[PDB]
Design a binder for these strands. Structure first.
Length: 45
DNA sequence: TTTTTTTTTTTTTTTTTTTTTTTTTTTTTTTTTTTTTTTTTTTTTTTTTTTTTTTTTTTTTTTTTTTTTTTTTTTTTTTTTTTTTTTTTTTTTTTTTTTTTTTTTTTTTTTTTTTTTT
């Protein structure tokens, strides 16, 4: 691995935004259908 | 060993621009002054029977000047076009909801030092 390794802006943007979007969708905002709680409520309880 | 070329930051102080303190004009805001509404009671006004002498409408006839009337030529009415205003689709922007990422301030208390004023 070199000190500097070029990366396309499209791939970096796609990877970063998809990681953030999937993380939010799966574990910040929507509730689970079974227990009806977000991860915040589950962890607090 | 002496002597010669070049390079920049300072003696800089002045020109240009920027920043920061100012105060005229149309849009708010508190006051006094004039329009509204509900009670008391109060002499006062006003609703309803009886009698009465009145003065205007309906028998009948008359005319004349407003109702008949026809026609010329105007002139208001209608047509087209275009501009001005009103009104409603369209678009844009902003706010709130709930989990996330980030920050930012005001005062007590004592003791010692800078930092201005007299």
């Amino acid at each position: 691995a070199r000190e500097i390794t070029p990366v396309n802006i499209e791939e970096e943007l796609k990877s970063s935004y998809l990681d953030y979007a999937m993380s939010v969708i799966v574990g910040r905002a929507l509730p689970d259908v079974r227990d009806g709680l977000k991860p915040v409520h589950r962890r607090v309880l």
